[PDB]
RNA sequence: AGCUAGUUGGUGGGGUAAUGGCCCACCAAGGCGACGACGGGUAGCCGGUCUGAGAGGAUGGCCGGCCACAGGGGCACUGAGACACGGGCCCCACUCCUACGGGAGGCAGCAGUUAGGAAUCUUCCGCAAUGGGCGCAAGCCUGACGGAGCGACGCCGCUUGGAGGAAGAAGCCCUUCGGGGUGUAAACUCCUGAACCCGGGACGAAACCCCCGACGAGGGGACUGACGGUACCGGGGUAAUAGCGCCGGCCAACUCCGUGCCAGCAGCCGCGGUAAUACGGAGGGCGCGAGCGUUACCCGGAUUCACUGGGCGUAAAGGGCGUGUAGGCGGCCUGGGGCGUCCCAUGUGAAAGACCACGGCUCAACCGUGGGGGAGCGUGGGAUACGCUCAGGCUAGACGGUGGGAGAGGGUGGUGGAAUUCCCGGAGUAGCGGUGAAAUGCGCAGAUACCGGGAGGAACGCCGAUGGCGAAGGCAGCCACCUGGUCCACCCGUGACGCUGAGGCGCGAAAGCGUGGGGAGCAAACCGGAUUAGAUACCCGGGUAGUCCACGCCCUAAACGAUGCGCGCUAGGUCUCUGGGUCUCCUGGGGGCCGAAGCUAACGCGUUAAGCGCGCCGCCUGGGGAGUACGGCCGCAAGGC
RNA sequence: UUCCCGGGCCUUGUACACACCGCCCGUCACGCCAUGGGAGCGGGCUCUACCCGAAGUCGCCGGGAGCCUACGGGCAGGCGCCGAGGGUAGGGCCCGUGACUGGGGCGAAGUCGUAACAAGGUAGCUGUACCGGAAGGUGCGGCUGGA
């Protein structure tokens, strides 16, 4: 019955990226739409659009991959190596401004929901807020 | 388990078991002997090891191994119990301290004389 | 797993500095509890301390804060304050003096004795300092305190010399006897020089006091040290304590002799039974050094209670299955609030401790100063993405309508034939049964085989399938009735009604039990006959409960897919069952095989997950003792949880 | 080429690997350790009812009986409630102990048999019921952890 729409979306993307697909569909939410915007600016995907499927609004999330490499298993590298929901609906995780993770020692991104909108780990500490730690992506 | 179950049911603790009941965890506990005898070891080894049943001041009567080569222990000897077991001897989980009380240490033991209670040879040495 | 008599609440009093069932009358029947009441066991609590990468775990000795005690127990008095450690009264235990009737005493204050124990100190000095009490002051009291004494109990600092020195003494150890080692080590040469003798010898001390100014501000003067002749400084000055653990692997350090599963070692693996780096010694070496080891306990390793950070198909572990209460969790759009949540300042977070500096004791331990943030909670202000709530609204979730579809789904009642056994009649004879082979047994008293008639019970061949239905156990001749689940189509209705589910409740194979029927075949037990060393078995002949029915119990299993349910996502090839269609083919549900990606220790799984995610429940934490013991609940009992 | 012995390759199964001259099971016997039940015995803690009940607060009285400094009063004293505690009585929990008895565990070489591991010589396991010196056997039903 879709307990967690956002972990559903992140798992949608996690399964789409393992079989190297053009895009996959996820039902639309104004909050999901913000999270996909943040994934888009950082270069984890190529963008999105409010498509319509059977009178029901989904979101085509166009995937981005690495270059075709050589040797056995020429399947490319992922742009998203690891994406997982941190704060669960049964396990709420709330962080202040001084307690924010360093995702892959700066190389990754933490996405988290604050009173100043949906932000990243760098943007949250720039603005100085902290909030519900949505997910870590790299 | 789930976080809700861990809230409801919690996590248990190890709660160690005392391998030496020397009563208050005393490092040592004195008792008079009652029997000074020789016992045979377990399956893999073979000897006649020297043990003693000791009527502790804990109110316990326990066996105790008599280390070193040779002893001076009798039925009415007073002796200090140490702790630590002999694996080939079942029922012996505690050691006698030598050089403490009526029990004396090994004579002519000249290497590891901090153990087995032997005094320094003072022979320009 | 239930507790509750002042018990819960009220009214009016008593009482207190003061609220309050704190106590008392009268009234009402409440109060608490799985969010763990009540009860049992244990424990003084904290700042802090130990450990840890941290999250955590452990702990509360010194010191500071709080509490509670003062031989056991109770009570008041005085008083601002006590239920009063060195004040009072009473009861008991104990001790001491008694002229025997009635007195005295309370070291959990500083020392100290005794008992216990593995174990824990001086019946020291002084009010010079600080602090407390009384006092106008002088001063007096101060076992608070300042110090000293004892114990390597701990930490820190220092010494037992330094530099020279033989192709390398003696001793002793090993030797492939030539040599190698201890070893610059020592002997020996100088130089410095702990300890000890000698003189000086304090910081901690300046006030209280006195004079002036008025016993104010201010200036000046006087007395006073326990520690202690000690620290420290100067002069002189003698080479001057070293030990303990280990040397198989973890783990750094190897040979020789003795020994022979003996004596012995031991933390685990394990060594010792003739050539032992594992025992005993020696030589040598390694690790430390006024210590070194051992024991006992705490954290660590232990990510073996996993919040970080574990799992459950086969290793420990999915509840037998459903239903469902509490609880946990929950779709898309729009606003109100601003509880969760975030931010800002502010209040608090005592000191001490820890960290960062800078200093003080010749260094350090120790100590002083300054500084920095913690975390938690109060108040005020703000933010509204997510969670919550209130409200409006949506349809993908869910349920419902209409039209249908398959089925061993369930209960009741009825019925058909095949077969078995028995009874009757006919006909018919000398053997039939049975085994590996036999025997028991049945048979001339007319068997087995054949026919005809009759009774009775149980189970449904072919269909029938590696097939179907159900939540599970499970369900199979046919018929009728009553009845649940379920799948498809059409996108018509309500519209978030959702998922899971501790207890509860219901179903629950076989076997077993109770009461009453029925009993053809089969068949525990039991009896025979063989097989066998012996057979309480396997093989054969009989054969009772039971298997069948009704009603009531019983709750077990390899109740197995050894895989809980719900939803979302991630190649397909193929077989089969049942629906719909523009039925060549597509699509939906269901049952199978193979296999993308991915997962697994492998075996294997693979949209009928063991993949990738989320929600909820159950369970696991070495083998045995053990599903045993005790307690509890249930059962007629067996026994069950 | 069935059968007896030995050998060769493949494949299947194994709980064997000193390798089937293997391993393994349960009574029985001796010894020892911990332990359950047990006529009872001995304590500890606790609860309930009643009896006696000191000191002492409080409440009366303070009168045929005292004392007082201001007496329609105070003190002494008497009575009462509560009361530490002692006594009696019956329960609850816990601990030690008990003739005897049940099972468990250990003890290098004890007696009896062959249960399981290979189709273990009757496939095994299992719930249950009955039976047997012992493992175990058989009945009914289920499982693949077998053919
Ligand atoms: Mg206590
Ligand atoms: Mg750790
Ligand atoms: Mg103390
Ligand atoms: Mg005193
Ligand atoms: Mg003593
Ligand atoms: Mg003073
Ligand atoms: Mg001075
Ligand atoms: Mg080594
Ligand atoms: Mg040794
Ligand atoms: Mg030192
Ligand atoms: Mg841990
Ligand atoms: Mg976890
Ligand atoms: Mg199951
Ligand atoms: Mg349900
Ligand atoms: Mg919601
Ligand atoms: Mg707020
Ligand atoms: Mg502080
Ligand atoms: Mg609404
Ligand atoms: Mg409609
Ligand atoms: Mg049943
Ligand atoms: Mg039955
Ligand atoms: Mg019956
Ligand atoms: Mg009867
Ligand atoms: Mg028969
Ligand atoms: Mg035989
Ligand atoms: Mg038979
Ligand atoms: Mg059950
Ligand atoms: Mg199970
Ligand atoms: Mg299908
Ligand atoms: Mg059982
Ligand atoms: Mg039981
Ligand atoms: Mg060949
Ligand atoms: Mg073979
Ligand atoms: Mg007993
Ligand atoms: Mg067999
Ligand atoms: Mg059986
Ligand atoms: Mg039988
Ligand atoms: Mg069977
Ligand atoms: Mg079954």
UniProtKB/Swiss-Prot annotation, chain A:
Gene Ontology biological process terms from the UniProt entry? translation
Signal peptide range equals: none
Task: Give one Pfam family, short name only.
Answer: Ribosomal_S8
Write down any Gene Ontology CC term.
ribonucleoprotein complex
Return the similarity comment.
Belongs to the universal ribosomal protein uS8 family.
Would you tell me the protein name for this molecule? Small ribosomal subunit protein uS8
Which UniProt keywords are present, listed alphabetically? Ribonucleoprotein, Ribosomal protein, RNA-binding, rRNA-binding
Q: Outline the subunit composition.
A: Part of the 30S ribosomal subunit. Contacts proteins S2, S5 and S12.
Entry function: One of the primary rRNA binding proteins, it binds directly to 16S rRNA where it helps nucleate assembly of the platform of the 30S subunit central domain. The combined cluster of proteins S8, S12 and S17 appears to hold together the shoulder and platform of the 30S subunit.
The answer to whether the entry has keyword Transport is no
GO molecular function terms attached to this record? rRNA binding; structural constituent of ribosome
Q: Which domain of life is it from?
A: Bacteria
Q: Coiled-coil intervals in this record?
A: none
Name of encoding gene: rpsH
Swiss-Prot record, chain B:
**Post-translational modification summary for this protein:** The methythiolated Asp-88 contacts a modifed residue of the 16S rRNA close to the decoding center, and might be important for decoding center assembly.
Tell me the Gene Ontology biological-process terms attached to this UniProt entry: translation
Keywords per UniProt: Methylation, Ribonucleoprotein, Ribosomal protein, RNA-binding, rRNA-binding, tRNA-binding
Gene Ontology CC, one term: small ribosomal subunit
Q: Which domain of life is it from?
A: Bacteria
> Cross-referenced InterPro entries, in alphabetical order?
NA-bd_OB-fold, Ribosomal_uS12, Ribosomal_uS12_bac
Note down the stretches annotated as region Disordered.
Answer: 105-125
Basic residues compositional bias, start-end:
108-119
PTM sites of type 3-methylthioaspartic acid: 88
| GO molecular function annotations of the record | rRNA binding; structural constituent of ribosome; tRNA binding
**Signal sequence, renumbered to the chain:** none
Q: What does this protein do?
A: With S4 and S5 plays an important role in translational accuracy.
Q: Which family does the UniProt entry place this protein in?
A: Belongs to the universal ribosomal protein uS12 family.
| Complex and partners | Part of the 30S ribosomal subunit. Contacts proteins S8 and S17. Interacts with IF1 in the 30S initiation complex.
- What is the name of the protein in this document? Small ribosomal subunit protein uS12
């Amino acid at each position: 019955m879709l307990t967690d729409p956002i972990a559903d979306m992140l798992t949608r993307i996690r399964n789409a990226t393992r079989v190297y697909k053009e895009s996959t569909d996820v039902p639309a939410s104004r909050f999901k739409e913000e999270i996909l915007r943040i994934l888009a600016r950082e270069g984890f995907i190529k963008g999105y659009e409010r498509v319509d499927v059977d009178g029901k609004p989904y979101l085509r999330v166009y995937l981005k991959y690495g270059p075709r490499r050589q040797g056995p298993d020429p399947r490319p590298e992922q742009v998203i190596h690891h994406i997982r929901r941190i704060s669960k609906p049964g396990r709420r995780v709330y962080v202040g401004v001084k307690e924010i993770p360093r995702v892959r020692r700066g190389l990754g991104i933490a996405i988290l929901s604050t009173s100043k909108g949906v932000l990243t780990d760098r943007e949250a500490r720039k603005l100085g807020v902290g909030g519900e730690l949505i997910c870590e992506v790299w | 388990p789930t976080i809700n179950q861990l809230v409801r049911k919690g996590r248990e603790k190890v709660r160690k078991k005392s391998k030496v009941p020397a009563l208050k965890g005393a490092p040592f506990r004195r008792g008079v002997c009652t029997v000074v005898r020789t016992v045979t070891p377990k399956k893999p080894n073979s000897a006649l090891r020297k043990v003693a049943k000791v009527r502790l001041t804990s109110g316990y009567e326990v066996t105790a191994y008599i280390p070193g080569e040779g002893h001076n222990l009798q039925e009415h000897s007073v002796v200090l119990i140490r702790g630590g077991r002999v694996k080939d001897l079942p029922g012996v989980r505690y050691h006698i301290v030598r050089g403490v009380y009526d029990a004396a240490g090994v004579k002519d033991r000249k290497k590891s004389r901090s153990k087995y209670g032997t005094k320094k040879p003072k022979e320009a040495a």
